[PDB]
Amino acid sequence: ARDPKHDILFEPIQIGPKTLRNRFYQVPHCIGAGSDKPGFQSAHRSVKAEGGWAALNTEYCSINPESDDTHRLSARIWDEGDVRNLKAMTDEVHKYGALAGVELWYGGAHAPNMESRATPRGPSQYASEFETLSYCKEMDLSDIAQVQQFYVDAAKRSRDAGFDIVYVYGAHSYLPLQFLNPYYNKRTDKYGGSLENRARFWLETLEKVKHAVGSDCAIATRFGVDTVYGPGQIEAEVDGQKFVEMADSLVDMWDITIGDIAEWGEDAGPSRFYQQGHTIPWVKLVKQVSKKPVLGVGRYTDPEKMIEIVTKGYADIIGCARPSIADPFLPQKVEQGRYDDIRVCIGCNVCISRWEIGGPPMICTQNATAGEEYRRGWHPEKFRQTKNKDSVLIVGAGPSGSEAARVLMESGYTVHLTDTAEKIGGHLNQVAALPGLGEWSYHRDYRETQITKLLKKNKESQLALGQKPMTADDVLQYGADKVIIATGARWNTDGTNCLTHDPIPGADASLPDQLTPEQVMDGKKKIGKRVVILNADTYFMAPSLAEKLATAGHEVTIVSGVHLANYMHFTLEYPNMMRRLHELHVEELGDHFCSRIEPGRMEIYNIWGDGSKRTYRGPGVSPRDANTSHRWIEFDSLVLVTGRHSECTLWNELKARESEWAENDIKGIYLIGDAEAPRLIADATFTGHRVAREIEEANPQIAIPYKRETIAWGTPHMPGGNFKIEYKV
Amino acid sequence: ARDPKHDILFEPIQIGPKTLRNRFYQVPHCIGAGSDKPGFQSAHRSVKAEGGWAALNTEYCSINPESDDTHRLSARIWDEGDVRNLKAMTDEVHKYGALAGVELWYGGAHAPNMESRATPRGPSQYASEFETLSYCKEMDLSDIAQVQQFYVDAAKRSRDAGFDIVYVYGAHSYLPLQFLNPYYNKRTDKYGGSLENRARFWLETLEKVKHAVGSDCAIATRFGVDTVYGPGQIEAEVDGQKFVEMADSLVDMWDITIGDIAEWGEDAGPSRFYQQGHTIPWVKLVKQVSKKPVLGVGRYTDPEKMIEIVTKGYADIIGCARPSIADPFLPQKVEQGRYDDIRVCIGCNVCISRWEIGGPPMICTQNATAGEEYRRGWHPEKFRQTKNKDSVLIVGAGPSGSEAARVLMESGYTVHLTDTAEKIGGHLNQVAALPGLGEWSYHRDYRETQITKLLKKNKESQLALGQKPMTADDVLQYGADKVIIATGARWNTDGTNCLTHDPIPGADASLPDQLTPEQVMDGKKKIGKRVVILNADTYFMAPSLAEKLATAGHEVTIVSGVHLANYMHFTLEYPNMMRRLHELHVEELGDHFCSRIEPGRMEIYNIWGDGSKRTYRGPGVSPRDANTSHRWIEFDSLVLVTGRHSECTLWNELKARESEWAENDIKGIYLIGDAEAPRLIADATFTGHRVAREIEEANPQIAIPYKRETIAWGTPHMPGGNFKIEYKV
Ligand SMILES: *c1c(C)c(C)cc2c1nc1c(=O)[nH]c(=O)nc-1n2C[C@H](O)[C@H](O)[C@H](O)COP(=O)(O)O
Ligand SMILES: *c1c(C)c(C)cc2c1nc1c(=O)[nH]c(=O)nc-1n2C[C@H](O)[C@H](O)[C@H](O)COP(=O)(O)O
Ligand SMILES: Nc1ncnc2c1ncn2[C@@H]1O[C@H](COP(=O)(O)OP(=O)(O)O)[C@@H](O)[C@H]1O
Ligand SMILES: Nc1ncnc2c1ncn2[C@@H]1O[C@H](COP(=O)(O)OP(=O)(O)O)[C@@H](O)[C@H]1O
Ligand code: SF4
Ligand code: SF4
Numbered sequence A, B: 001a002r003d004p005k006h007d008i009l010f011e012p013i014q015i016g017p018k019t020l021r022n023r024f025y026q027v028p029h030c031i032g033a034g035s036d037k038p039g040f041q042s043a044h045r046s047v048k049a050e051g052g053w054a055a056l057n058t059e060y061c062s063i064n065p066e067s068d069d070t071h072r073l074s075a076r077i078w079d080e081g082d083v084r085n086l087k088a089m090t091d092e093v094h095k096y097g098a099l100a101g102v103e104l105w106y107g108g109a110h111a112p113n114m115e116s117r118a119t120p121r122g123p124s125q126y127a128s129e130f131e132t133l134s135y136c137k138e139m140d141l142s143d144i145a146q147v148q149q150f151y152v153d154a155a156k157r158s159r160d161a162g163f164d165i166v167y168v169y170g171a172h173s174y175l176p177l178q179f180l181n182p183y184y185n186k187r188t189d190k191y192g193g194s195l196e197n198r199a200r201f202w203l204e205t206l207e208k209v210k211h212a213v214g215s216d217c218a219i220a221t222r223f224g225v226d227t228v229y230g231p232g233q234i235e236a237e238v239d240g241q242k243f244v245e246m247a248d249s250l251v252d253m254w255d256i257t258i259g260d261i262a263e264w265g266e267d268a269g270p271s272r273f274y275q276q277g278h279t280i281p282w283v284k285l286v287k288q289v290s291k292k293p294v295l296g297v298g299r300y301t302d303p304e305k306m307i308e309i310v311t312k313g314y315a316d317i318i319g320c321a322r323p324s325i326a327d328p329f330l331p332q333k334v335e336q337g338r339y340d341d342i343r344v345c346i347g348c349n350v351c352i353s354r355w356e357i358g359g360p361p362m363i364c365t366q367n368a369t370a371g372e373e374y375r376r377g378w379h380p381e382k383f384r385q386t387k388n389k390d391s392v393l394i395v396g397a398g399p400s401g402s403e404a405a406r407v408l409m410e411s412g413y414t415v416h417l418t419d420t421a422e423k424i425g426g427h428l429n430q431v432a433a434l435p436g437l438g439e440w441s442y443h444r445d446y447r448e449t450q451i452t453k454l455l456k457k458n459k460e461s462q463l464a465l466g467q468k469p470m471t472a473d474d475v476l477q478y479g480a481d482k483v484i485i486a487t488g489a490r491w492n493t494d495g496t497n498c499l500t501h502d503p504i505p506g507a508d509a510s511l512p513d514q515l516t517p518e519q520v521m522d523g524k525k526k527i528g529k530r531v532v533i534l535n536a537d538t539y540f541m542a543p544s545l546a547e548k549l550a551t552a553g554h555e556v557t558i559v560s561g562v563h564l565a566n567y568m569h570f571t572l573e574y575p576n577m578m579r580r581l582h583e584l585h586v587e588e589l590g591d592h593f594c595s596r597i598e599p600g601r602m603e604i605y606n607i608w609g610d611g612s613k614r615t616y617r618g619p620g621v622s623p624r625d626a627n628t629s630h631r632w633i634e635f636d637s638l639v640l641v642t643g644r645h646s647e648c649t650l651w652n653e654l655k656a657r658e659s660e661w662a663e664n665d666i667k668g669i670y671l672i673g674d675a676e677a678p679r680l681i682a683d684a685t686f687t688g689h690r691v692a693r694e695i696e697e698a699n700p701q702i703a704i705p706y707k708r709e710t711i712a713w714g715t716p717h718m719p720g721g722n723f724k725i726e727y728k729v
Helices: A004-010 A039-048 A081-092 A139-160 A175-180 A200-213 A236-248 A280-284 A303-311 A322-326 A330-335 A350-357 A399-411 A438-456 A472-476 A517-522 A542-551 A566-571 A573-581 A647-654 A658-664 A683-693 B005-009 B039-052 B079-094 B141-161 B175-180 B200-213 B236-245 B278-282 B303-311 B321-327 B329-333 B352-356 B399-410 B428-432 B437-457 B473-474 B517-524 B541-551 B574-582 B649-656 B658-664 B680-694
Strands: A014-017 A018-020 A022-025 A054-062 A099-105 A166-172 A218-226 A251-258 A294-296 A317-322 A391-395 A412-420 A462-464 A482-485 A489-491 A530-535 A555-560 A587-588 A592-598 A601-606 A630-634 A637-641 A644-646 A668-671 B011-013 B018-020 B024-026 B056-057 B099-105 B166-169 B219-224 B251-258 B317-321 B391-395 B414-419 B462-465 B482-486 B489-491 B530-536 B555-560 B587-590 B592-598 B603-604 B631-634 B637-641 B642-646 B667-670
Touching: A004 A330, A004 A592, A004 B482, A014 B321, A014 B658, A022 A330, A039 A054, A039 A081, A054 A081, A054 A166, A081 A099, A081 A139, A099 A139, A139 A166, A139 A200, A166 A200, A166 A542, A175 A200, A200 A218, A200 A236, A251 A280, A280 A294, A280 B462, A294 B530, A317 A322, A322 A330, A350 A566, A350 B667, A391 A399, A399 A412, A399 A438, A399 A683, A438 A683, A472 A647, A472 A658, A482 A647, A489 A517, A517 A542, A517 A637, A530 A542, A530 B680, A542 A555, A542 A637, A555 A592, A630 B278, A647 A668, A658 A668, A683 B099, B005 B303, B039 B056, B039 B079, B056 B166, B079 B099, B079 B141, B099 B141, B141 B166, B141 B200, B166 B175, B166 B200, B175 B200, B200 B219, B200 B236, B251 B278, B303 B317, B317 B321, B321 B329, B391 B399, B399 B414, B399 B437, B399 B680, B428 B437, B428 B517, B437 B462, B437 B680, B473 B649, B473 B658, B482 B649, B489 B517, B517 B541, B517 B637, B530 B541, B541 B555, B541 B574, B541 B637, B555 B592, B649 B658, B649 B667, B658 B667
Parallel strands: A022 A054, A022 A317, A054 A099, A099 A166, A166 A218, A218 A251, A251 A294, A294 A317, A391 A412, A391 A482, A412 A462, A482 A668, A530 A555, A530 A637, A555 A587, B024 B056, B024 B317, B056 B099, B099 B166, B166 B219, B219 B251, B391 B414, B391 B482, B414 B462, B482 B667, B530 B555, B530 B637, B555 B587
Antiparallel strands: A014 A018, A489 A644, A592 A601, A601 A630, B011 B018, B489 B642, B592 B603, B603 B631
């Protein structure tokens, strides 16, 4: 049953001329879709429609080629081709009976424009503190009118397109905010200086937009009421409130955030430094001056926390991004009181990783159909159920094999899931024990919860933890019709890395002063005063261990032969990770690899130590001047973080005797998770999702094709244009 | 007319079943188009077809979703949608009586596969030394059969798609090379170890591909004969020749490069460390051993150097890429001995900078239409002539106005080009005067050369150099019909950067210990022993200056508040620019910005000094713990590299008086190049390309729409496929 305290959550609300069925709102967020992947765009929001979110929005949407985000992908609404492709989504959000917003964006010099080549305009000439090579032109007054018309234009085309909501997107430090904020705005004419100068641009723009589609579409704005930068940018209690005050008659809805563009990690809080509701203290302050509907994200996945912020008159509605990617159905689950079925977004930000890399599609570590709803046509809550009696053994119940079973059992199969560990989760279990990552548990937590639930519903199906590792004999004699090995990967023992692809001589972590991140993480093996983490890994492992050990008070140097924490730049984690390693006085030696380990001693080298000029030096002979900077650093205990390898020992074995599966009634064995290859957690979890959804194809071991959304020669993006080559002569 | 030494160059050559008209052929290279931009692909290759090149290739072309390079773009030949889409270009190469090649690609784990999410295979389990989180699974021997299949399936569809040439791509360290090359191959079986095993993989592959389309299609290999690593990886005189030996019977033509993946710069040599023919030593060794046609890139632009390398039997053919982007017509310009009309690629590698960021189109610093041949139908050698007697004043003869001149005059306009510099070229004049960048002059060299010849043909046109800078009133009373201001930008003088967008306290390069990048390059200002360069810019200025000063024997520390030479990463400049800064004992202080300059001394700070824990702290205070890292360093002379700004003074003047333009018979004034806003040279040059082409539209100052290559809803990529959502249930 729905706990009736949550009723509050299903009460409509008025937003201008528009009505939100309920409180659950998907704010604008990218997905790797834009106007360019109209399949993928429609499907992924429409399931959240069907899932019962109230309003769904496109990601930030460009009003004009002089705000082009390439290499990133944004959405666009430049022409009637765009109004085509975005309408696919509106119709589709419509048929389920919520609303379609579209987020009107121009971002000035934050748009590098690498496709459109055009020149970006701003309040003042600057160069982006994010695309640092990309400068704007200073708008004169005629530039102020032409760009504003831009939005108008774009607001019209938004209505043709079928949007029920339009925004003047003023967050993450894009145009309207750049005017407002003195950081950017060095104008001394009437658009600058006085608080009502600064906000004229936006104030104007808002009005123009209202005038434009005001009577058919609610105009909302998003606004970044505090920059969390302090004095010198927007402060909520300085410019923030006041601005709210000056706008309020224009807005149908506020949509609130804090942060800029360069470290929007602060909006999209890592669970590694932010909890739920993080934003609230600055969220709150907006109701205390607005007389209008106010929502404001903050990784709100808990309906308890949801009701708090409404019954305490801190928001009116619930703004979500990530959590809607995790679980497009999270509302109808809350409406249906199905509390345990809710897939909790972990704050891992892989989802922001893809978009932030420039091009690839979003993927997600809980929701493996995210990105997969058009092109693979996987629905997150409906599954093809089997038309046989077939059964599956799954070895190992980590991300990979646990999704494996989740999906299969949801598919109706008969499954036996076994692992040698005592609990569901494979290596997530240590991972979540690293400082900060405690909310990454959630990913086995949800699995443990559903397999348990799935077992009462399949009667043959079986969970078995605490088992004796399986052998290939147990396996061939097991009686599953099919077998999924999902046995994992371990840190490399031997200094094997991405640079050399061979072992570091004198690396081996059976020796007393030499650790893996398993041994550091198990907590048994003893750890010397002086530590050196030898790092070949660009993702979280290294920094994190660093944090751990430092906080346990060792003296810490990371030797890095790769750019440390590079991945993290992309999950929005990097700022606060660095500041953090600073704070704990963690020493970083970059651009530095290692050539032999000895007790208490390792030989390290700068990777740009070779010679700058390349000569044909004949065979047997380096064609640079050789690298002469190697030097010997000591350590109590060395922690290798060099690479990882697949544990495919059993699968080696099962493969070797693949000749006996046929007598054993085994129709196939498939490899998945880290055991095929070391992958993201997300990607681990997909490979399970896949073999499952695909257990019935010829070779499940390999994916079947998926829709591709790429252009067909002889078809005009533009309606009724010439596809043909056409030179201007 | 054609110096007859050069006829050699137009002598046809046999390649298996296929005939090359002449010895000018464009090897495989990326443009940012692949399968996804078939207008673009077709056109950009067709005009090189029209221009006389004999065989044109697609860029690296994917055989299968488990080699996807997203977020990079490569081509695809995965199904019918692809065959259609690649067809357009083969049809279009064909109409000019040239060949169409397609380079068949598998990458193994250098394919991050972020679109497809699939798992890539190799000879051995590794993690790419490039895409460091992306690992492959190790082929069993069925794996070995499956992958080769792929090549075959792909090579048939190659044929359906209308290609004349099919490669087995083995360069830059992709799959084939990954077997052959022990750095990757750790197999102990019949695929591994001996030389005969290591080539097995390629060897079979080539076979089956020949068996597959051998009859209709030239089978090419591209092969990396030395990795330019030394022993341990491939050496020419070790396995290189020996490999060529083994293969020689299958291969209709060698295509030789040197280098790996993670630093392929060495193949695509920067003119800042490679001169023309740089590859030869290792290129020539191939002939020694081969009985087949051999070509081998080395940025050949010079027909002399061209005919050196054939007569010396070092090559049989001429392979370019870059020069082919530079001048699609280069050969019909050799052929027509119109040597002064050939646009020499300067080896700035900006072209490879877009592909390498991953997603954007290529663009080029000498050729403004590259990329621009489909979606804006600009042809590199054909201009829409003017239908009036209008005249243009252009103020400033730099990349941007000089390109503006060159195109306008080519379009029949009467132009008068004024610049207070002595020589055509604006800032590139200094910039070519940096260590290594001597080959960048070519980019003015070529326009001085065409404006001088255009004058002769357009008799009232005029060039005037060494003039008094124009004033607002000169311009008004100048009588041009329209005016182009192309006045430039300058390094910023007061410590204005992209991190505060404010000037630093105590920077001013009127003081005798503080210099700008112009002052430095001029060689006038005296510079003291110890130097700090305070860098905000992520391109070549800083490092270059460092290079020069150091080699002037000052003592050198780079302070950088951004990541130094980030761009150069993407030009493939970075490694050798590092080892160079290394060899010259140049000091690097990164993640360090500055808050105060005094005479002899500056106050710098760690950008990760602030605290990690963000609390709401009320207005007017920092919400992190404040930064306590500030500390003073000394210098004799300080070099500001902190940003740049637009010289827009004249323009702010002419527009204040826009009122009096009509009185003065001025229909408009348009602003371009750095003066509108600070941009690469490429871009600055494009801006001038653009206002020319478009001198006759509404508002020149703003570009017209170009065709876009995005999918239109309801049209399937797949022939006869379903565009509509369809979930699997
Ligand atoms: C892209 C990505 C995937 C993420 C997850 C967020 C995001 C993305 N693109 C956005 C954009 O187009 N415009 C915009 O205004 N916001 C965009 N977002 C951020 C999102 O809307 C939220 O503000 C944050 O994720 C924080 O809230 P929450 O997800 O914790 O609920
Ligand atoms: C892309 C870019 C634009 C550059 C010019 C080189 C290049 C690019 N993409 C390639 C890819 O598709 N596969 C491949 O094997 N090589 C690729 N290259 C290299 C190009 O083929 C040449 O090997 C070098 O550029 C040097 O040639 P040159 O331009 O000096 O004549
Ligand atoms: N012999 C096997 N039998 C049962 N479990 C195994 C066996 N080999 C490895 N495991 C288990 O496999 C799981 C592998 O998990 P993990 O690293 O998280 O891989 P993945 O991330 O892809 O799921 C672990 O819990 C480990 O206990
Ligand atoms: N006021 C002026 N009158 C004449 N020439 C000018 C004037 N102001 C600047 N210039 C010229 O403008 C050119 C600007 O060119 P440059 O900085 O190279 O711009 P870009 O990179 O856009 O080509 C410089 O060569 C300088 O000659
Ligand atoms: S990738 Fe992680 S943070 Fe993002 S929506 Fe998914 S579970 Fe949430
Ligand atoms: S960008 Fe530079 S290296 Fe490239 S084709 Fe153009 S001139 Fe050549």
